[PDB]
């Protein structure tokens, strides 16, 4: 089977930038190289076949080039609807193989997160467990640290985090840190606080309840 | 295996086309029949 | 024009996973197209499972040929996939796909590409049995945030909407997380103007079709 590798694995670009994605093969694929676009909401969508040929309704901003073991997709004037993940595929051999994918995400100005804290629902405390949510809304860049502190004692392991995909219009991320506890332990303590560190914050920001 | 066959057949198609417009086709039949006669 | 894939959400190990793709544009016996199945593992690797022609000819990926079957049903215009002796490693998004068959005299002969894809259909392979989710309010205390915590459900996926589709701007529905218990949990949160809490009611509509669970929970400011 023909090995496919794209470079770079991840990249970021500002709207307007030129973006090139490279696809290298272990053998020569003699121009049987296709490019496809993947967005999370919609069905996958092809954009190029046979190295250069654009399909109808694909913008001519996209253009393909290459030969042998080395191919390249190029986005001329990258627009909001173009941020997505791109795959190359070979049609030369009997078992078709795709590349691993190049994810194109947005670079934009730093934006600090809005921090919220949500206490656990009465209903769920009746059920016998307790979830406490920290929400970090609409921030960039993606990297952010979320510390849990219960009665000034630092926590670890009992909490899980999740992060949304970049917003279609805002171009920013949001993140939920859910802290799950037995009703016992949650009843033990008094003061629950969520500490946030992020590039766009000068001092760590903490939000808390009793 | 077929999808792999097409990668050689494309070159065969190219070959056929270049001798398509360049040696008319009636000429091709005629020389075909010439070869056959030698049999 | 339209390709609708469907099948089970959850399949037991050593079971058989059967999918159907309903084709809503033209007949599957159109001699201009092949059809194919392509799958994506959660590890993002894309794999060609196999192709089938209106005439009956199939190609199967070597690593699966011992245990895969594709077939079309012209009478109802569907294309079916069966995958046997299924393991956890077969948990994937399964796309049904169309592939132009260019005849010899086309300008674009021998160019083989997947030109149209359906939305996909996710299949988890696990011994665990279905489980509907619990829905708990995340109550608000310039702009306020509120939401719904959708905890302890199996398998994926659940869909959360707000005001039956009417509230769309400012919504953030998070990816699920796998808890130690082996069940899934997520949160969905919206930011609204605080002036509106005491006047506008906010309901979240959670749906979990793998267990036929539908729940509508209203989120009121905290007390
Ligand atoms: C975004 O733009 C600035 C401009 O210099 C650059 O330094 C930075 O590396 C970019 N961010 C990323 C993640 O590449
Ligand atoms: C395989 N191919 C025919 C599409 C391209 C190879 O031929 P060429 O374009 O290099 O002359
Ligand atoms: C790519 N194309 C289908 C438009 C033309 C193919 O011709 P060729 O590149 O094989 O000579």
Residue numbers in the entry:
A (entry chain A): 1 to 210
B (entry chain O): 671 to 709
C (entry chain B): 2 to 35, 35A, 35B, 36 to 82, 82A, 82B, 82C, 83 to 100, ...
Paper text:
The membrane-proximal external region (MPER) of the HIV-1 gp41 fusion protein is targeted by the most broadly reactive HIV-1 neutralizing antibodies. LN01 engages both MPER and the transmembrane (TM) region, which together form a continuous helix in complex with LN01. The tilted TM orientation allows LN01 to interact simultaneously with the peptidic component of the MPER epitope and membrane via two specific lipid binding sites of the antibody paratope.
Crystal structures of LN01 were determined in complex with MPER-TM1, in complex with MPER-TM1 and phosphatidylserine (06:0 PS), and in complex with MPER-TM2 to resolutions of 3.2 Å, 3.1 Å, and 3.9 Å, respectively. The asymmetric unit contained four complexes, two with a continuous straight MPER-TM helix and two with a 90° and 110° kink at the conserved Gly 691 in the middle of the TM region. Molecular dynamics (MD) simulations of the LN01-MPER-TM2 complex placed into a bilayer with a lipid composition analogous to that of the viral envelope (Brügger et al., 2006) revealed a 25° tilted orientation of the TM segment with respect to that of the bilayer. This tilt orients the LN01 Fab on the membrane such that the HCDR3 dips into the bilayer and positions the lipid-binding sites to interact with lipid head groups. We further observe a bent conformation of the TM region, which has no role in LN01 interaction. Although this may be a pure Fos-Choline-12 effect, bending occurs at Gly positions that are strictly conserved in HIV-1, HIV-2, and SIV TM sequences.
